[PDB]
Design a protein around this ligand. Sequence first.
Ligand SMILES: [Ca+2]
Ligand SMILES: [Ca+2]
Lengths: 123, 123
Amino acid sequence: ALWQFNGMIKCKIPSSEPLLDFNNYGCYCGLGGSGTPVDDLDRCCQTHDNCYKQAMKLDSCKVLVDNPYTNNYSYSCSNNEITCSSENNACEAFICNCDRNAAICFSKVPYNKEHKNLDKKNC
Amino acid sequence: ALWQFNGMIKCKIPSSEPLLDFNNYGCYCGLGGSGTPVDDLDRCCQTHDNCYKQAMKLDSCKVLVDNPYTNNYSYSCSNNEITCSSENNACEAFICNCDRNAAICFSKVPYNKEHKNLDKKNC
Ligand SMILES: [Ca+2]
Ligand SMILES: [Ca+2]
């Protein structure tokens, strides 16, 4: 769920408020996404959106009322690394992996502030 | 919270249903506890009860409506080891440590089935 993804990104980027910094960035970072990623961060968000789309196709996820934004799963941050828990059921474990991969991708690419609150004419 | 402690013990003892196996055992394992531990497992439960008592004394815990049984915290099981998350606030982190120590103590001591549903005359 979104709260865990928030905690994951802070795990890798301790100076960020993820819901502020990485919301509404580029064509993909944020609810929705369309068109060509504007940079590498946006491309991280595109992969993550595609991972969420693949999760919602799985039979395990289809059974659950919860969607990837509200489906709580368990993970730990320890020494700035993320580990998804073996206690997670198949759906929540796939989502945890999506989010972990996105948090790592976020920490390894440039942040271009001029893509912040990008006017969606560009997408 | 109790759900996480359940998952923790299964992390170390994958064949157990912890809420069945380690509830109502000896003088301490279970809600309450008094008197002298009947064996080492019961002693694990006494330490854990004392750790919960110490947690409820902390200013961080005193602020929270939640008690150690309902206070959800985050942790992961991975390769049968437990890691409490850096995302945990001070109260939830102390509780996570109590529970982790108890799960480990449980996996390292004998289980004496004859102490199961011990008649509390003995305590
Ligand atoms: Ca998106
Ligand atoms: Ca007890």
